[PDB]
Amino acid sequence: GQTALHIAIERRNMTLVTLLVENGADVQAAANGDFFPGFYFGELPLSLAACTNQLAIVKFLLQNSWQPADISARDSVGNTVLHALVEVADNTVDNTKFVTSMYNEILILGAKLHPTLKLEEITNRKGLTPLALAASSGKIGVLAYILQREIHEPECRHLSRKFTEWAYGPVHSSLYDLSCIDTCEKNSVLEVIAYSSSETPNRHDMLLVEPLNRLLQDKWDRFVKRIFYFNFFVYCLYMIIFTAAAYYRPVEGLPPYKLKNTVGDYFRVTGEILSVSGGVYFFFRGIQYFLQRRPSLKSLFVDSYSEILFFVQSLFMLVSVVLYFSQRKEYVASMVFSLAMGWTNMLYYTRGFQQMGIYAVMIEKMILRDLCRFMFVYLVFLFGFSTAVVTLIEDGKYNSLYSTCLELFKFTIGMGDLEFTENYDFKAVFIILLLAYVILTYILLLNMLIALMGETVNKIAQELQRAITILDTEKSAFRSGKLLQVGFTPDGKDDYRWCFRVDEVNWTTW
Amino acid sequence: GQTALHIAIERRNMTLVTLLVENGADVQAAANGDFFPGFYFGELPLSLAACTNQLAIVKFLLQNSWQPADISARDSVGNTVLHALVEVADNTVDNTKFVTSMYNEILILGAKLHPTLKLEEITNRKGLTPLALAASSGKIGVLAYILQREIHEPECRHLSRKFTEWAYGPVHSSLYDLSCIDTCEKNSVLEVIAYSSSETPNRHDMLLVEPLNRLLQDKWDRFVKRIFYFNFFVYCLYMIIFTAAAYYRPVEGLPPYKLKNTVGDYFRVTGEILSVSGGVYFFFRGIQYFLQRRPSLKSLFVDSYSEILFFVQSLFMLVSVVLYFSQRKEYVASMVFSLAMGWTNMLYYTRGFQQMGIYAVMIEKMILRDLCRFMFVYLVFLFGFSTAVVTLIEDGKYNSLYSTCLELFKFTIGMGDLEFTENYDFKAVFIILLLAYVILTYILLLNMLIALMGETVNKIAQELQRAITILDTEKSAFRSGKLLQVGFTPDGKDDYRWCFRVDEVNWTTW
Amino acid sequence: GQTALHIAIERRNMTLVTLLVENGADVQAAANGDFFPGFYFGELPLSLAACTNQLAIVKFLLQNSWQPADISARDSVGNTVLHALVEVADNTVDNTKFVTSMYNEILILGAKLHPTLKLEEITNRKGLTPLALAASSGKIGVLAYILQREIHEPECRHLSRKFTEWAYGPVHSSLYDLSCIDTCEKNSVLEVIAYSSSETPNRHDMLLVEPLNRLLQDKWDRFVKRIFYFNFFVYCLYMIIFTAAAYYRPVEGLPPYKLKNTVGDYFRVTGEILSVSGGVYFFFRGIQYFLQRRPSLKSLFVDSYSEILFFVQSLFMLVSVVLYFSQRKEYVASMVFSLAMGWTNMLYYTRGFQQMGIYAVMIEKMILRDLCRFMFVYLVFLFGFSTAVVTLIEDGKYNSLYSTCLELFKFTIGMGDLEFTENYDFKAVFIILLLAYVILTYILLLNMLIALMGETVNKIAQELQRAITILDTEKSAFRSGKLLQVGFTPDGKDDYRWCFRVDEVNWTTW
Amino acid sequence: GQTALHIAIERRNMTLVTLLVENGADVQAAANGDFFPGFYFGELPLSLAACTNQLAIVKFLLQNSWQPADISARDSVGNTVLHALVEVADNTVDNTKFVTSMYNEILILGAKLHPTLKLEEITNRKGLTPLALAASSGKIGVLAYILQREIHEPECRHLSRKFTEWAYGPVHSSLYDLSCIDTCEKNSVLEVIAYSSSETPNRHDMLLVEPLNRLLQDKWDRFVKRIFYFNFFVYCLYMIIFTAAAYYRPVEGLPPYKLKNTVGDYFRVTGEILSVSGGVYFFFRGIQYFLQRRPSLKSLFVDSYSEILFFVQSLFMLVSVVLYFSQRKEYVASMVFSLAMGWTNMLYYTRGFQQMGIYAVMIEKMILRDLCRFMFVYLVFLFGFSTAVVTLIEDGKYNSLYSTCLELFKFTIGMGDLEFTENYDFKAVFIILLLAYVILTYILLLNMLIALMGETVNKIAQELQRAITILDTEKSAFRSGKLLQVGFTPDGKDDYRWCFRVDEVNWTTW
Ligand code: NA
């Protein structure tokens, strides 16, 4: 699908390009090769020039007597030259510098040639703006350049995003464009950075850009602290009510239980109803959370490992209700399961409280990454050695697998047991096997712990929990801007862009 | 409240300032704006010039035909130009360099114009000298510059603080001004650095400046070692006497106890009186310590966590006396409480003894920061799981909460208990709950310990206990200087400033 | 054995060398001194010049009217000038640079003078090419230079190994010579790097050179994943069959056991036959592995510590069979030993699964390096203290060594025992000895663990498991190349060298 | 005591010094001031000039028409100019460079003016050569310069210490002067570095200088390996004999024991005699070791902590003999004590065996530095809490201190005990006290371990055991040189200086 102009752009023989354009060959068309091993640039000469160190060629292409190159052209994916430039970024110092410079130059040139049109709002077929993709794909450099972009040339000042409302000696106040940042209402940058599954390279590094962290802190201190505390208090109240109702369970038999006229019975019924309603609410919240987020199965356990616990607790409560209305005695078992699991899940609110711990990330390094491994290996060892031992046994209580495993389990943990290291032949063989099993398992545990410590030392000497907490609570006085005035457009109309006031104290470069 | 001269100082159009002053507009007045978002400089043109890179403007302002600018002017807060310069410091290399240079230049110029006056002793309304505020607010750079300041120009040599009594080849001896350092008797710098609540940025970094550490070591080796050892010995004697008196408590009944003529009874009465007197003394010492220090409630536990223990021990002893003189049998309980707590508090003297341990700071990282967290979480888990278990129980001894919690406590710690994992339905449910509880609690403990180790490795690869011990013991042969002679004043009078002899061995720059 | 030309080469008096050669003295001969304290260079003037900063002298020697120096001469060891240059490399930046430059220059010059001959294929008496020795002896720099060598001069382009099939803007594809790399079929470089005993300096650092890692990954993802999973599955199946057969062992007496017509008996016989066949297969695989590798006795335990376990398991199974066919009752003991050991050896497949753990190298730092040390020291302590204690004992059950050691063992581990700290004189002496023993042993354990952690922190902050797994499984759709065309030889014949396509995305130096 | 010439040397007015010397004032005399706050230079103008950046003045002083300055003058301490220069060194890069240059210049000048005299052998009143003091006082730079000193000027080449017997291309062999290094027979440098108490700054850093480490390794591989192994074997034999003799102790009563004619009795008597002789030998070796070393009391435990153990073991054996020949039954107790302690002391030979452990220095960081601290604190806690508890007790078995402490000891370690948490009032008080005691003690232990790990990580990331082992075994085929020839003296006599051949492979600077 390649055409001569594409090769000339690649060869950069600007004489040949000028000769091809002098006849007026073409300036758009498109490449559609399977290769286009491969390399993607937007299947256009405009994008090809913009992406491969061509300022002269792109300047010549965008406007010319024979056939001006439309800058608003949308490709099969809708990849505009700006969106293609975003797609090509690779997060390198030289590459980042060059791509930011190219973005600036192309934007200013397009504005100067066509001031009425605004290329920033252009979106692809998927329905994403170039900044939205820069955030989704993890392009830190392009995002950093855009979020604090500024233009110092008349007739295109409107394209800038950061300004300086007033400067005073050392202190000077700067304004930031929050449009498409806090509430884009469609694919807000914060939302995309937060939602996006955990494989993007620099999800954490992209929430430290200047406006974002301050915006999150402002939202927090505005309302989210109160929302979080209210949720914590109401959850504690619900758990206390559930515990009180479950403690006073009647022992007559085979529910349902008939209401007896008394204050205690009325209170018990009220508490039962409230607990069931709360469990039902949790079930619905979890199911619709899953519906609207649609996370990857791989991310269910690595991420969002608390919502699953809440959902299964709700499942336990619902199963308890079902068994309660079926004349069964296992409703109590299900109820106690749910109660204990809720008391455990109360830990979710440990966050939002600095005092409770700053480095609570080892929970994820350990409750799965090492606990599950150790349990698996230990169970395999248990089964194998128990089978060997029971095979060695002649008769008695321990010629069965379960009895032998239950006691080989006891020896290991120091509970010990009644010494059945006796009453059979091959005494030395049995003692040797027992020693081997106990040693090996404790060796394995010792390794898990050594690995934990060795990882934590540099995980803590090499390097956002609230960045997610704030958004989730927000999505359980929510503007974060005031519609300032930053001049006018190419036309003479007041421009309003939800500026976020920020003031920094500086004491040099006066 | 801003006036044209203020703007001109900000704009730095020294032509415009010269024109404004040529008419003789004004050179003092004051700014009083709510803003004066904000920025503080001393609400004067003199301070404004001194604080914002103006040497020419300040030189022109301080003296001029039309209206010389009084350098001794005191503002609403009493902020002199020097005190304002101290207030503006932000602890940056360039900012520190500039502010120190400005301080030097302004001091020398003011001395030259008005040699009789001494601006250093000037104090604000609060009653603090500029050095005192530099120490209180945590301005390390300004303090470091001032403490070892020196002037190499005749007619202003008196303003210097560091000198060179005699230089000998490699070795040369320098003298340091200790006025307002060791015993200012009002707001001594050491005292301010020590008292100041724990939020100042660099309280530790400000006790390493050259004179201070040597001064503290000299005071220590002079007297404080002996004072500390004497206190330790007398406390041990008192504790031994108290233990001996408490051991021989009579068992007759319902004090007070009538004196029986015998040597043992006389000794017992003497010991009881001495112990009560000591407890009373501790109570008074603690109460008046609290009165004269008035620490923040937030700093009671983080800092001064031993004085609180001593005070509560004294409270226990006093309550014991009160119950003793009321015909009650709980005086023994209170007495044993106080005795045990004093034996524990004996640890306070572990400091002052290098040999006992250099890195004993983990006490603070752990006895509160992790012990309290773990206890809280473990108690919550205990309550929830015990309620669940007792709800599951049908009848018997363990259908009560306390009996179940007392045994669920025993399983966890390896004491175990008589196996009540029996004699009821839902056996598997109970065993599952028990396993969950035990596991979870030990998982939590394992995390606390991992966090401890991971924090300690770099707390000990990244970075004063005696700096506080020495001052406190001093405040339970206390001069640290000898009134040397360092020349004369602008007048012809001998100058005495409590020089502290210091000699350093150097082998370069000859 | 040294001759004047050798000294002149050492002295570098190129005038004297030219005068010696003008008469036509000689250009080959050989040195044979015991010294040739010592220094090896290939016992030739050609090699001596090439190895000691002589380009002019080597250029003059290789060709001259009087006596051209044959470059293909082979010495007593067969050390060609190229092979000698490889032997002299010492892995230093300057030395590496110089030796690579000398190799390049000598190769190109030899090709230009004698294009028909190919010096690369030349091999020593041992039967190794220069690259093979560079890999065997651990010469990283020479290997790195050779593996990605390239020549930019006509008439010798064939000597190059790396090419550029097509370059496209940023992306450009390069081809690598895999001849003598993947399957040399004689002494392949990968094979030599892997086999070579563990004393070579940089066995790990030599498997990161550009082509090698990508080649290993390609082989893995091609077939080795499937081979490994198939082996794991079949081993699990065999172990399950063995366990099932061993569980149902009859209890009649004194094998062999007569076949009773029933489905269960048929299945039991089938399982027994399969298990014996598997053990026999493992025995043969291990013995022939040892035969064909012939590792050092020192490397048996440090390396290949799993094959030994498999072999001894097979030995246990064979001994079980032998005792089974001899009317003995210890076949069961041998069978259970083999069963347990196989269940343990199942851990070998933990590798090949990232998820199970990345840092599983501490196994080697600990299962031997610390476990064996601790066991040895603890057993010595046990023997000494038990002898002392039994000597102290007067009469009773514990006047024998075994009874005392069995109980001194119990005290230490917290099992405790029936308190025999009673019923004899010198009570305090016994208690003191017991305390000493217990303390000392736990002190020793505490040290082993401290050393483990202190080593692991920097072993994990300072710095291939699959590099060996892949080769071993390969040697349990195996080409890794496609016979590309890279031009022609000095003659006009198509050249085929098993190119490995590789494409790298680069965004600079255009 | 200062004289005008001293001041002029200090002022460096070489015109004034020339004028003072023109009259011929004096060139020796001496300073004797109490100051000579202070600064020591050798109380001479020659030493003063040499020590304070004076080459011109020292050159003028050493020789002049009026009064040549004797360079061999010895002061009150005998401080020659060279010895004074050694004394003044402070181990700084600039100071080290300058002092080495001054030493070189003064030595060469003194040799040229007076070639017959040799200033190196000059010794102070204490009887030490300048190199000996450089080693004793910890002057690393001066020692490093001297040990590999070289002079490239005829008529003074003899003063050099390092030479080059033969250079061959890359490899070149250098010879080192071992006189006064290996066996000075008086105050050998190695001996001084080893003996010297543990306060010298860089005892370790001074055993890495080029000749010393190679010399130690050569001595080791020559004989010390065999000596060490022989000692280990003979000690093991003696311990086995002692254990066998002690096992068969007769039980008749009240030694001495009459000899009964039998092989067993003869063997028993032989073993007893051998054991007593060995203990006696150890006692004598230890006492005379202490006599000839005379270490500081502070260094007895920090250093040489194994010789003390051996000596006390010998004391136990001797006391056993004494009680044996006095008709007492405690000879057995003493014998078992000595036997157990010897079995423990066997650990001393763990060194000399790399395999047993490289980082076995934590023994010293822990067996004293933390074990003793923890034991002390724990015993204090034990006493205090036990006194409190026994005071609380009313009657029964535990109204005595020992019974209560013995059980409060048991609770802590998990042995537990028969639950006496019962049968008295103030139940809650007792339980609270018990919890407090147990917690506090385990908290303290946890801290000791945390400190251990935190210290070991950087003690092992920041930085000789055999350096001491080798010397001690040597001092339980001992030349290490061969009397090479290195030219002649200023006279025409062959010079012999025990050269140590050393050859280094170098591949640059040809
Ligand atoms: Na136990």
Numbering used by the authors:
A (entry chain B), B (entry chain A), C (entry chain C), D (entry chain D): 201 to 236, 243 to 603, 627 to 692, 699 to 711, 719 to 752
Lines from the paper:
The capsaicin- and heat-activated receptor, TRPV1, has served as a model for deciphering lipid modulation, which is relevant to understanding how pro-algesic agents enhance channel activity in the setting of inflammatory pain. Identification of a pocket within the TRPV1 transmembrane core has provided initial clues as to how phosphoinositide lipids bind to and regulate the channel. Here we show that this regulatory pocket in rat TRPV1 can accommodate diverse lipid species, including the inflammatory lipid lysophosphatidic acid, whose actions are determined by their specific modes of binding. We captured several states of TRPV1 ranging from channels in which the VBP is empty to those bearing different bioactive lipids, including distinct phosphoinositide species, brominated phosphoinositide analogs and a pro-algesic lipid, lysophosphatidic acid (LPA). Together, our data show how the VBP accommodates a range of bioactive lipids and how occupancy of the site corresponds to the structural status of the pore.
We therefore obtained cryo-EM data for samples in which diC8-PIP2 was provided to the empty-pocket TRPV1 preparation. Using focused classification, we were able to identify two key states, one corresponding to a closed state (3.0 Å) and the other having a dilated selectivity filter (3.6 Å). In the dilated state, diC8-PIP2 sits higher up in the vanilloid pocket such that the inositol headgroup sits above Y511, which is reorientated toward the pocket. Moreover, Y671 adopts an α-helical conformation and M682 and is oriented toward the pore axis. These features are hallmarks of a channel in which the resident PI lipid has been displaced (that is, the pocket is empty or occupied by a vanilloid agonist). However, there are some differences between the diC8-PIP2 dilated state and a typical vanilloid agonist-bound structure. Most notably, in the diC8-PIP2 dilated state the angle of the S6 helix is more dramatically tilted such that the voltage sensor-like domain (S1–S4, VSLD) is pivoted outward away from the central axis, and the upper region of the ion permeation pathway, including the selectivity filter, is expanded and stabilized by cholesterol and another membrane lipid (probably 1,2-dioleoyl-sn-glycero-3-phosphocholine (DOPC)). At the same time, pivoting of the S6 helix makes the new restriction site formed by M682 narrower. Thus, this dilated structure is consistent with the functional effects of diC8-PIP2, which enhances capsaicin sensitivity, but by itself activates the channel only at highly depolarized states (for example, +150 mV membrane potential)8,9. In this case, one ligand can bind to the same pocket but with its inositol headgroup located in two distinct positions associated with closed or dilated pore states.
